[PDB]
Design a protein around this nucleic acid. Structure first.
Ligand SMILES: C[S@@+](CC[C@H](N)C(=O)[O-])C[C@H]1O[C@@H](n2cnc3c(N)ncnc32)[C@H](O)[C@@H]1O
Ligand SMILES: [Mg+2]
Ligand SMILES: [Mg+2]
Ligand SMILES: [Mg+2]
Ligand SMILES: [Mg+2]
Ligand SMILES: [Mg+2]
Ligand SMILES: [Mg+2]
Ligand SMILES: [Mg+2]
Ligand SMILES: [Mg+2]
Ligand SMILES: [Mg+2]
Ligand SMILES: [Mg+2]
Ligand SMILES: [Mg+2]
Ligand SMILES: [Mg+2]
Ligand SMILES: [Mg+2]
Length: 81
RNA sequence: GGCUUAUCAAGAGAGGUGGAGGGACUGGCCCGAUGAAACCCGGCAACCACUAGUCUAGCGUCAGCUUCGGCUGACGCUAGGCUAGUGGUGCCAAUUCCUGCAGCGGAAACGUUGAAAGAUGAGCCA
């Protein structure tokens, strides 16, 4: 649901900075795009699942970025709340 | 900050940190969360100073040679070029990424001349 993202108050964009947000429990939910390189995605589904944080999935990384205000596409987005 | 001048069609880490924009302006078109700027490391390059080493020439002192005018050698100095380090910069996607004023070749794509406007160094002025 790109809506949940386009509606979220605060959020982090991109894999690196998200994994970093997961590493401090500030994250409420995590959205990751299927079409993105798996080596990059599974990186977050693991840290996410292992922590017991909900993980949602969206078809495109180019639409995900659009939902964040970025103009280039994001592999994953953390929702800080 | 400005003026003068030189250069700008090559080269340079799938890097660390970092977090949202960058490519001067211009109209584009590129680059960016698969990570922009900045900082650091690393590299390219050789513009300024210095340090050597190297080559060249004139010159000198000694030394051989002399087909006797003159060559050759070491060494020293002066001068210059090259390379290698220091220190100072600069630079590390797309020709100065393309257009910006005026032309050139070509059938077009494309290539290209000079400016304009920038960028960097050096020397002055602030
Ligand atoms: C295009 S500009 C800038 C070049 C840039 N610094 C480079 O290394 O690619 C060319 C001028 O930069 C100056 N410059 C300063 N540092 C330089 C360097 N390391 N290598 C070449 N040029 C340099 C020179 O005066 C030269 O004429
Ligand atoms: Mg100023
Ligand atoms: Mg000016
Ligand atoms: Mg030219
Ligand atoms: Mg980088
Ligand atoms: Mg911040
Ligand atoms: Mg990074
Ligand atoms: Mg050499
Ligand atoms: Mg680099
Ligand atoms: Mg024209
Ligand atoms: Mg013509
Ligand atoms: Mg056309
Ligand atoms: Mg043209
Ligand atoms: Mg000019």
């Amino acid at each position: 649901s790109y809506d949940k993202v386009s509606q979220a108050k605060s959020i982090i964009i991109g894999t690196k900075q998200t994994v970093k947000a997961l590493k401090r429990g500030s994250v409420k939910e995590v959205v990751v795009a299927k079409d993105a390189d798996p080596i990059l995605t599974s990186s977050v589904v693991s840290l996410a699942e292992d922590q017991g944080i909900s993980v949602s999935m969206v078809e495109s990384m180019k639409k995900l970025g659009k939902a964040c205000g970025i103009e280039v596409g994001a592999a994953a987005v953390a929702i800080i709340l």
